[PDB]
Amino acid sequence: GLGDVRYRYCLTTLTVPQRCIGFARRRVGRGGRVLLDRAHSDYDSVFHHLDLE
Amino acid sequence: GDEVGALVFDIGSYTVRAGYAGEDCPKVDFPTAIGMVVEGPTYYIDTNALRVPRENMEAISPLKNGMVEDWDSFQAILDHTYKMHVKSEASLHPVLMSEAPWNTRAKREKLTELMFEHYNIPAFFLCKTAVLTAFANGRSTGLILDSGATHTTAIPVHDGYVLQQGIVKSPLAGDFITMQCRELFQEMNIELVPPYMIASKEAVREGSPANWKRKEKLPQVTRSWHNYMCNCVIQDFQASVLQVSDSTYDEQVAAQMPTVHYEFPNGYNCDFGAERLKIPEGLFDPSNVKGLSGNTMLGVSHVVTTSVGMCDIDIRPGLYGSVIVAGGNTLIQSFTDRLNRELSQKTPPSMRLKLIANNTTVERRFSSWIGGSILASLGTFQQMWISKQEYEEGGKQCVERKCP
Amino acid sequence: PLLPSDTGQGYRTVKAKLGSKKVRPWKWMPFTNPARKDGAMFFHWRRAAEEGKDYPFARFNKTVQVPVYSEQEYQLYLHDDAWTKAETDHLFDLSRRFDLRFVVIHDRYDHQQFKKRSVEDLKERYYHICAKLANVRAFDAGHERRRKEQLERLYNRTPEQVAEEEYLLQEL
Amino acid sequence: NQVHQRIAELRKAGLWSQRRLPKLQEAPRPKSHWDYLLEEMQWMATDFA
Numbered sequence: 001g002l003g004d005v006r007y008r009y010c011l012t013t014l015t016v017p018q019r020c021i022g023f024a025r026r027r028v029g030r031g032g033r034v035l036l037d038r039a040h041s042d043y044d045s046v047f048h049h050l051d052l053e
Numbered sequence: 054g055d056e057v058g059a060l061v062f063d064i065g066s067y068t069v070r071a072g073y074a075g076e077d078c079p080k081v082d083f084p085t086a087i088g089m090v091v092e093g094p095t096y097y098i099d100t101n102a103l104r105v106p107r108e109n110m111e112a113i114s115p116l117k118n119g120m121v122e123d124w125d126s127f128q129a130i131l132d133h134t135y136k137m138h139v140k141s142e143a144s145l146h147p148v149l150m151s152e153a154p155w156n157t158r159a160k161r162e163k164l165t166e167l168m169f170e171h172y173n174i175p176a177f178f179l180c181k182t183a184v185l186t187a188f189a190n191g192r193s194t195g196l197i198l199d200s201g202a203t204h205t206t207a208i209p210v211h212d213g214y215v216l217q218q219g220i221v222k223s224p225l226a227g228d229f230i231t232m233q234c235r236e237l238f239q240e241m242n243i244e245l246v247p248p249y250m251i252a253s254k255e256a257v258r259e260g261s262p263a264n265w266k267r268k269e270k271l272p273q274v275t276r277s278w279h280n281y282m283c284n285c286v287i288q289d290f291q292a293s294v295l296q297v298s299d300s301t302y303d304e305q306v307a308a309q310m311p312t313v314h315y316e317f318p319n320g321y322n323c324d325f326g327a328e329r330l331k332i333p334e335g336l337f338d339p340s341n342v343k344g345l346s347g348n349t350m351l352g353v354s355h356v357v358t359t360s361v362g363m364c365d366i367d368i369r370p371g372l373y374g375s376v377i378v379a380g381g382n383t384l385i386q387s388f389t390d391r392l393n394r395e396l397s398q399k400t401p402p403s404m405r406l407k408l409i410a411n412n413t414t415v416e417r418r419f420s421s422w423i424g425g426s427i428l429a430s431l432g433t434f435q436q437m438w439i440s441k442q443e444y445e446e447g448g449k450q451c452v453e454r455k456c457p
Numbered sequence: 458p459l460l461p462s463d464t465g466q467g468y469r470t471v472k473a474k475l476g477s478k479k480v481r482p483w484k485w486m487p488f489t490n491p492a493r494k495d496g497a498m499f500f501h502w503r504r505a506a507e508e509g510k511d512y513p514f515a516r517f518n519k520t521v522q523v524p525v526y527s528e529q530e531y532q533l534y535l536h537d538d539a540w541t542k543a544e545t546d547h548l549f550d551l552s553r554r555f556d557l558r559f560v561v562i563h564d565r566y567d568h569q570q571f572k573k574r575s576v577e578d579l580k581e582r583y584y585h586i587c588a589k590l591a592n593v594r595a596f597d598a599g600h601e602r603r604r605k606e607q608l609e610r611l612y613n614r615t616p617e618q619v620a621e622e623e624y625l626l627q628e629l
Numbered sequence: 630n631q632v633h634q635r636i637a638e639l640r641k642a643g644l645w646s647q648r649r650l651p652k653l654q655e656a657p658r659p660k661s662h663w664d665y666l667l668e669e670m671q672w673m674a675t676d677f678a
Binding site for chain 4: 556628
């Protein structure tokens with residue numbers, strides 16, 4: 001509800017070291033290198049619930 | 054390589070900064086002041102010349118209220134920079150510098166002329182320091198607060214453009230803190246035994262008389278130079294003691310802190326109490342300053358109120374979205390926490406308030422240099438360069454045509 | 458709250474694929490920017506072969522657009538009544554340079570030398586001038602002024618009074 | 630009683646002297662580099678942080 005156009009983050013896991021990554025979004029960087037930026041939010045310390053408790 | 058080997062320079066109220074473009078931190082820094090031994094003449098710059106004792110130094114600050122004072126000193130300091138640190142021919146390298154909110158067009162033209170003709174710089178640019186810092190925070194419309202060593206000023210910005218009206222040249226700064234330390238020494242009566250005149254600092258306890266040895270080889274210095282190195286000592290002491298009460302000050306509340314065992318160059322080391330918190334509370338309101346009924350200054354919350362009110366209504370929410378810190382004296386502890394408390398109190402909840410989260414020394418001071426490097430890095434900015442060919446064509450008068 | 462970066466190495470497992478693939482060279486070549494009319498010669502770390510390509514990044518030359526008058530518009534079509542030709546010219550110049558940020562224009566418009574005029578005064582004057590030019594060559598100052606004075610009144614509304622106003626509103 | 634008193638107060642105020650801010654009207658505007666400059670600035674600055 002805060003309305004930040006660019007601060008739209010989402011959950012996901014990784015391919016090889018699969019696990020709850022936390023609210024994260026991809027972003028381009030210098031030298032045309034994409035980088036994953038993992039956020040830090042109200043549930044930062046509890047990023048493992050699963051099944052939508 | 055959409056970045057050329059450009060160099061960004063940052064000079065603040067307290068010290069002088071600079072470094073390559075796009076880098077994390079300015080490469081170097083050194084004291085804003087320079088020690089003068091009248092006889093070209095003997096210039097003392099950087100610690101090895103300035104703080105290390107010599108004979109007859111008259112240290113001079115070529116700055117004043119963010120103004121150019123000793124053009125020869127600026128040229129000499131630039132040459133000192135180049136040789137002693139960079140060792141390069143910037144004539145081969147574009148450069149740029151920040152500017153004050155109020156730098157005279159005459160002096161800006163003077164420096165532009167000097168740069169292009171003498172320093173043979175290939176390109177130049179200028180912009181206000183607060184704008185650089187606001188860039189550093191990735192912000193377009195906000196309020197900048199800087200407790201540089203000289204002033205404690207507030208200047209809002211909008212769309213990357215300063216509000217000319219918002220300038221506040223408050224006096225209070227690390228100079229004021231040095232005055233507070235001096236009145237503290239007076240009320241508790243400790244002299245200033247500078248380190249340089251102490252061969253050995255012999256063992257001594259709290260309250261113990263200053264026990265020390267002098268090195269006979271010490272040619273006498275001037276009161277200017279000696280007093281200023283003593284001021285450096287005082288600022289070190291402040292840092293060792295920096296703190297502010299987070300609420301309405303109380304003498305005994307502040308005294309409740311365990312008196313910190315701070316040592317002095319002589320080797321003496323007493324313990325300091327509530328004074329370090331009695332002092333700063335005046336920064337948040339000069340009226341309450343016991344003994345000194347400072348009223349001309351605006352208390353921290355008073356500064357906030359003044360700056361907010363003097364703006365217009367529509368953007369004030371935008372400015373409240375950002376609040377920024379800067380300056381050598383911004384080292385103070387309890388700085389931002391008590392700042393925000395005083396806000397929440399005096400600042401109405403009517404408008405949403407939001408600050409800028411940055412407290413490391415690196416950010417807290419060199420955010421401006423960071424913003425400058427940030428701008429230099431951008432690939433689009435290159436159209437905004439200032440080619441030396443254009444300056445050759447139109448004199449230094451091209452600044453007015455190209456810089457409003 | 459950090460950010461992993463792309464990794465290509467991982468492990469010493471890539472002996473081959475390089476001897477067949479030359480590293481295309483890079484050179485600190487000069488260049489010129491079209492966006493700089495004087496065409497200042499600067500440098501790029503281009504990959505050698507990418508030499509002479511037009512400056513790819515200077516295609517953003519989009520700017521503000523403001524009209525102009527010479528001798529009659531200021532007296533025939535855009536015939537002024539309150540401003541000087543100098544005042545109209547200065548307004549339009551500040552607009553062109555500032556790209557229509559009317560608050561910026563006003564705060565950087567000479568109120569003393571030119572006629573002292575609020576930001577909305579300049580806004581309405583420009584509205585008249587530009588609309589006259591458009592229609593002859595083919596925007597609500599009053600209501601907005603009323604709304605803005607209302608806004609500032611409400612803003613100045615003393616915080617306790619605002620508190621009881623909101624308490625009523627929620628109490629509904 | 631609450632309805633009557635609230636009505637009296639909020640009318641004698643909000644008839645013309647309370648909140649009730651219709652809106653600022655809109656008008657068109659072209660655009661220039663500055664959007665691109667500020668976009669690049671934000672993006673790269675977050676990158677650096």
